[PDB]
Amino acid sequence: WVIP
Amino acid sequence: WVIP
Amino acid sequence: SCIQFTRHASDVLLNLNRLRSRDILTDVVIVVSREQFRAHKTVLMACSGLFYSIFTDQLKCNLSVINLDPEINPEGFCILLDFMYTSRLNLREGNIMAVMATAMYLQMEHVVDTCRKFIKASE
Amino acid sequence: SCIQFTRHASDVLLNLNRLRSRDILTDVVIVVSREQFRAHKTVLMACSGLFYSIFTDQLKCNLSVINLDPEINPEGFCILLDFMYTSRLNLREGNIMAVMATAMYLQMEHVVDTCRKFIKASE
Ligand SMILES: CSc1ncc(Cl)c(Nc2ccc3c(c2)CC(=O)N3)n1
Ligand SMILES: CSc1ncc(Cl)c(Nc2ccc3c(c2)CC(=O)N3)n1
Ligand SMILES: [Cl-]
Ligand SMILES: [Cl-]
Ligand SMILES: [Cl-]
Ligand SMILES: [Cl-]
Known part of the structure; x- marks a missing residue:
C-alpha cells in the first residue's frame, strides 16, 4: 500500500 | 513497454 | 519472449470503472440493508473470495440480485466497491x-x- | 486521502484471465475466419476502441456472436486477446x-x-  |  | 505494457492493467481497470459509472453492461445488483449497488459480476469475482464462490455456483451464477448479510454496513460496502x-x-x-x-x-x-495494521498503530 | 494497493489492477487482470481460461462467465464468441474465441464483453471493451463501440450499441450489446472482417488473421487476434x-x-x-x-x-x-516502432527499427 502507498500514498498515491 | 518493457522486457518482463 | 513477450514484451509487456506496464500501464495496461491500470488502464483496463480505469475503463471498467468508466463502464460502472455509466451503468454499462452491469449484470448484478448487490443489496446491502436496502441500499443497492450495480456492478459487473466478473470484477466482483476478481476482487472478492466471497463473490468468486457465489458466481461460480451453478445456481447463484444466474441471479441478477444478491442480498448481503444484514450486519453489513452499506458505507463499508460502497468504500470496498x-x-x-x-x-x-x-x-x-x-x-x-x-x-x-x-x-x-x-x-x-x-x-x-x-x-489490521492501521488499527494496531492507533492502539 | 485514499491509500492505494499497487498490485490491485494486475491481480484483477490475472483473475479475469483465470476466469477466461476456465470459460467462467464469458458472454460472447468472437468469430475470426471460422476460428472462435470466447471472452468477456467488458474486458474486450476495456482494451479495444472497436469492441467499446460495438458493445455500447443498443442492438449489438445484446449479441452473443460477433463476426470480424474476413481479412482479420486468427493468430493475430489470438495474440491480441x-x-x-x-x-x-x-x-x-x-x-x-x-x-x-x-x-x-x-x-x-x-x-x-x-x-510501428519495432518495424521502423528493422528497416
Ligand atoms: C483462487 S483462483 C481465482 N480465479 C478467479 C477469480 Cl475471479 C478468483 N477470485 C478471488 C478468489 C479469492 C480471493 C480473491 C479473488 C481476493 C481475495 O482476497 N481472495 N480466484
Ligand atoms: C474513451 S471512454 C471509454 N470508457 C470505457 C471503455 Cl470500456 C472504453 N474503452 C476503449 C475506448 C477506446 C480505446 C480503448 C478502450 C483502447 C484504445 O486504444 N482506444 N473507453
Ligand atoms: Cl484485497
Ligand atoms: Cl434474481
Ligand atoms: Cl493497446
Ligand atoms: Cl447472437
Whole structure:
C-alpha cells in the first residue's frame, strides 16, 4: 500500500 | 513497454 | 519472449470503472440493508473470495440480485466497491471498523491486512 | 486521502484471465475466419476502441456472436486477446504485420505504436  |  | 505494457492493467481497470459509472453492461445488483449497488459480476469475482464462490455456483451464477448479510454496513460496502474498481481505499478513523468487517466478509485479504495494521498503530 | 494497493489492477487482470481460461462467465464468441474465441464483453471493451463501440450499441450489446472482417488473421487476434487479459504481447518477426493490422482494426493504440516502432527499427 502507498500514498498515491 | 518493457522486457518482463 | 513477450514484451509487456506496464500501464495496461491500470488502464483496463480505469475503463471498467468508466463502464460502472455509466451503468454499462452491469449484470448484478448487490443489496446491502436496502441500499443497492450495480456492478459487473466478473470484477466482483476478481476482487472478492466471497463473490468468486457465489458466481461460480451453478445456481447463484444466474441471479441478477444478491442480498448481503444484514450486519453489513452499506458505507463499508460502497468504500470496498470503489476500491475494487480503482485500487484506492478511502480508509478513515470513522469507517475502518466497518471497512475491515466488510472486507473479512467479502474475503478481500489485502484490505483486511492494511486495516489490521492501521488499527494496531492507533492502539 | 485514499491509500492505494499497487498490485490491485494486475491481480484483477490475472483473475479475469483465470476466469477466461476456465470459460467462467464469458458472454460472447468472437468469430475470426471460422476460428472462435470466447471472452468477456467488458474486458474486450476495456482494451479495444472497436469492441467499446460495438458493445455500447443498443442492438449489438445484446449479441452473443460477433463476426470480424474476413481479412482479420486468427493468430493475430489470438495474440491480441492474450495481451488484453495479461498485458503481455507475443510480438515476433513472423507475426508483427498481422498483429499491427489486427490492432489497427481493433483500435488498440498502444499496440499499434509498439508495432510501428519495432518495424521502423528493422528497416
Ligand atoms: C483462487 S483462483 C481465482 N480465479 C478467479 C477469480 Cl475471479 C478468483 N477470485 C478471488 C478468489 C479469492 C480471493 C480473491 C479473488 C481476493 C481475495 O482476497 N481472495 N480466484
Ligand atoms: C474513451 S471512454 C471509454 N470508457 C470505457 C471503455 Cl470500456 C472504453 N474503452 C476503449 C475506448 C477506446 C480505446 C480503448 C478502450 C483502447 C484504445 O486504444 N482506444 N473507453
Ligand atoms: Cl434474481
Ligand atoms: Cl484485497
Ligand atoms: Cl447472437
Ligand atoms: Cl493497446
